[PDB]
């Protein structure tokens, strides 16, 4: 309880303590769709890729509001970057899914092991002697130019080519292939490239199978230590919503610092703090990112306490934690849009990191995971029992 | 910890156990704007009036989470009577800080004793020997039918009729005479009529100023119990905002329950819950009910800390809990709003709950303590340190 | 052009000359659940009932847009009012479908005949020699009570009771019995009550086929009056939305008339004013009533555009007018939670109009032909060309 | 009235004609922050730019409904191009303020002649003989770099440097330096480059007064033509709306098209028009934008109609048209929201031309004569007559 409270005070006082490298990397990996080599370095020092890893493999195995918390202060530095850390946290607890042979293979003398993950069932696999081949091209790899290993899903064939079933596949760099296509205007540094591959072989210890990947067994396995029996699905939308919601903190701050030093074009108002519409407003929209904060912070305490109490969280819990998290970044995106009246046509000058704030939360907001009209309709859905929209909780 | 928590459940428990009895008194508090007797006696015996109370009177001395989960219960079975009970409980912590012998006179003998308080100035007071003459009318006294005492705020004057000061003055039932002027069209059964006095004498030890009423000052008093450490015009607020928003929560609760057997009219829906447009949209509507719900816990649970803690919150931390409310039944009116379009036409029948907690809701919202839009400028006003815009916090 | 423009203004100058009327009967109709006779005299003597009469039948015969602006300003003296004399005319210009002897037998020899009409198909009819038997239990009967015909829609049976097609069916007053099941808490003096038919006879000349009841084939028809080729189920709708609106705009009249002589409490603005917060949040409240307004006036215009040309309007326009009506009515129940906010407390008593309009316009609002949800898929499916989701457009 | 009516279905015409050189122009345009000579040599040969120029000088001389709508048409194709040609047309309006001499000088002999325009009094000017010596940097000058002439707004001072008036001043592109300051993340093309001036003389017949600048005093001359008797700064403004409001229809536009072809990850939804939900949510958005196009539409008309009319609109008519302007863009940028979350990642990338449409509305949204803020309280503050908050209307 006050020990893992404590290392998270530690962590957020590393991330402010690295924060200026990644800040100092922003315009680069604007330019280059990269991030810098510094960040990188900076990532693997800070341990901040090891916060949902093994502490058997030197992880610092943490929970998911730690992670939380961590990932909102990192969006003030750069969000593309803290976009990348939660991704890799997030995959690397998915990995835990695997047999012990596989995680002892990517962990085993990799303690900062970075994973990449897209669960688009984008490619097909094949039976062949002591594993599968796989054929595929995955979209969206978030940073998957800096990642060891990369989890994706594909949908098993037999030889006529008939869907079988679904295929949860662990495949490393050194099998790897990026094809460059992202181009965006937001959140451009995360390198969300396109993973290719042709006939590649993964043997059967880092495969398993769909139901496996999304399964809520250890849930209630007393053997395991609490980060693993969490709900690994929703502990990765909780901390992508973090990420978003730090973006819209920290552009909120931003708006509070400039506002006693200019004004309301074209208005008698030579100082936007004399205008009691803006004041009022401006505590208006902190109200709605406020409760954006106590959306993701309720469902991260969900999944933490019955991750530690080693209780399976029924469908409605996990339904709810999905309209969380949409609703969340819904009214993120929102008062950002409220913070760009607020500020005023000085905010999307390129030096202005409000517009910054404003590209990449809104490019993170629409990721499958945090897609608040699906949230609604699962959420909704589950006063009644309908069933999920989507396939997996 | 774990004693308040387990308090908490039991009080819950009692509101369930006396909650038919007030349910059943609705429809005559309906027609006589008035709580019935049976209601009193299922107060007076539930001890749910004595949660503010202090123990060394043989009152439930609980916190302002406690007093705001009961108030939100509470709502379900009557709104009025959990207005009613959650005024009586926040004027009683507001007479804590009137002099012993005040606290004697009203407690004393009587563990179940039940305050007003209105704290609009609308009366004048004069110094005469051994006291002060107070004349005035004071409008929305709430559950003044009732009560035993009143706590009436007046403005001070010398000879001449120069204001001196402000007051705050504890006067009894024999002393007060109502007049009926509560004719309204929601929280009917309240009897928030108006208190009237001409040259009515108030002793000295019943009198206090304007300022120590206010006052903030036994936050940090260790020989106090936590409760009397709390913010106390800040805690009936946050107990007030609860019963509005139990009110809506309610209105949820009906409009889930009766989805699955009506229709929407006129389209080919028979069914509410086969419409995804109606399932996504109750979805949306529950979770600003939501952030509502954690808005008051937020504001309950930094006002339980502090007290607790036995640490003065600032300002910022006050303004922030008014902004808290008042978004809260904002968020609130909005979703029953929505809730009407959700149930339909049958919502407005007199014979359909729905239509009451939408009435009582939007009524017992507009009180000057939840005003949205000056919660607004005060919370939006901390960010820079302006004047607050309201007399107390 | 100017003809029918000319007319307009008279009529508006009526609703001002039988207004004060309407306003004193609205303390009686709040009682009693039903207008009273000074209303109905005034109803009579205004020919407001009788704006999409024939004028063959010494009928005023106006459009679409002149009953919209008329029901907006009856309104602001009797919501109730409003809504029956526009039910009225709106059924008075449905039964146009029926036959000319059923016409005859209606107007012939009364042209401020009024009547009621009920589309949810509520009862049961066979044939029989020279007509039908009908049998049913019609709710929501608007203005019942004064009307001297019924438009009762029904389902055709064989002898064996198996469903055979849809009907509407024109039934005199002396055939009609009436329930008292009109309790509700707005649109009070309307008397929506329950029509009930217990084998009664009605004429083949006085019924129709469901299909020729919601027909636009008249579009087109040069033989016809405009009047005449209106889209008549979509001009009842738009009309409706008027007595909402109107309704709406009163309230915010109130409101601007009112907040020089008040203040916000518990804050320092004395007067109400004087604080920005409050005139700038006005100004986005009256903008959005305004949007409604422009919503209703729209879809009024391509109803009467298409009629004067003679040219029928496609499904598409006719499913964008659905969406107009019910996000107009939508926007006026949300700018008067908000006009609540702006005025305070004092709105719920009940000498305040501001309750009034507020209860009589919320009630309205979910009458099936004005359901927001509906209205956002029906006009949504149009961009797709999807099946519409209502039986009639 | 038929030939006014005819001139813009031409215009809008033309804008089709010329709208594939626009958009193939967009590219180049996103890269450099300027519009390409292609572009340029389009608005040229359109004739685009001199709608607002006078028939004496060979120009187009149509009106603000006539504008508005080639403006809306024009942002399908490029928002920067729409953005340009509407501030030229409303600047060349502006210049009709000064005296013929300058009128003559400017348009005399160019009938396209092309103005820009920057009314934040950004310069200082002293009397010289002969005329002005004036020095300034003024900021956010779009489309500088193509216009042939600026209209500047000064501050006049003495030989002691005291103020003394305000200034509008006409001064040739040979007389203008343009520094390199336009680096945005929306509008980019569009050039709003900063224009200096160094002890630049300008003579008396291109300066007049500030006061003369935003004068009304023609709206009654019988003698000017029916434009130049328009509000000329309310003008420009609903212009400047219009771009914006085109930009999000074009966007409405693509998202519809797009829908079918698609799915809503990760839902079961394969085909996003098989989700009511989305479907209508999409109803909802387009609504939004329905509204701020009557908005727009409902101020330009009554712009047009008092400059037919040759009546002079009162102050409480021009500040609703600056309530009118600011509501429609915010409920632009609002809806662009709402169709991001429709549309999905894929709007971000930079081959879609979604997230083009969305930058650039919400980059010009934030002009000044633009914003919802100033708007709202202008508006609101005209229901009880409170003093302008801006300078001119």
């Not at 296509?181 to 042709?198: C, E, P």
């Not at 208006?284 to 309720?298: G, K, N, W, Y």
């Not at 629409?366 to 997996?392: C, K, Q, T, W």
């Amino acid at each position: 309880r006050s020990e893992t409270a404590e290392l998270r005070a530690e962590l957020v006082e590393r991330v402010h303590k690295f924060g200026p490298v990644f800040a100092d990397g922003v315009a680069e990996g604007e330019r280059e769709r990269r991030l810098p080599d510094a960040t990188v370095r900076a990532i693997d020092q800070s341990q901040l890729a090891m916060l949902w890893t093994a502490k058997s493999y030197g992880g610092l195995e943490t929970d998911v509001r730690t992670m939380s918390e961590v990932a909102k202060v990192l969006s003030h530095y750069c969000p593309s970057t803290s976009w990348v850390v939660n991704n890799v946290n997030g995959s690397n607890l998915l990995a835990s899914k695997f047999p012990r042979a596989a995680l002892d293979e990517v962990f085993g003398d990799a303690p900062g092991a970075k994973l990449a993950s897209v669960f688009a069932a984008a490619g097909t696999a094949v039976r062949t002697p002591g594993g599968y081949r796989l054929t595929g091209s995955w979209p969206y790899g978030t940073g998957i130019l800096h990642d060891d290993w990369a989890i994706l899903v594909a949908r098993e064939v037999d030889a006529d080519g008939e869907p079988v079933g679904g295929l949860s596949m662990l495949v490393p760099a050194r099998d790897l292939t990026v094809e460059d296509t992202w181009h965006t205007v937001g959140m451009r540094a995360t390198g969300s490239h396109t993973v290719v591959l042709r006939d590649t072989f993964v043997p059967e210890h880092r495969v398993i199978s769909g139901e496996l990947q999304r399964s809520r067994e250890s849930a209630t396995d007393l053997g395991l230590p609490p980060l693993f029996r969490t709900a690994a699905i929703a502990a990765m939308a909780v901390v992508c919503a973090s990420v978003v919601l730090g973006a819209g903190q920290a552009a909120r701050a931003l708006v509070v610092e400039k506002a006693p030093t200019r004004g309301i074009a074209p208005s008698k108002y030579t100082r936007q703090t004399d205008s009691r519409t803006f004041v009022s407003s401006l505590g208006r929209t902190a109200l709605s990112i406020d409760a954006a904060e106590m959306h993701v912070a309720r469902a991260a305490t969900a999944l933490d306490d019955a991750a530690y109490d080693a209780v399976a969280l029924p469908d409605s819990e996990l339904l709810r934690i999905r309209g969380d998290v949409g609703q969340a970044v819904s009214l993120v995106t929102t008062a950002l849009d409220e913070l760009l009246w607020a500020h005023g046509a000085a905010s999307f000058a390129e030096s202005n990191p409000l517009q910054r704030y404003w590209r990449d939360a809104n490019t993170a907001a629409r990721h499958a995971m945090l897609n608040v009209h699906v949230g609604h309709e699962l959420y909704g859905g589950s006063f009644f029992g309908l069933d999920p929209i989507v396939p997996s909780l």
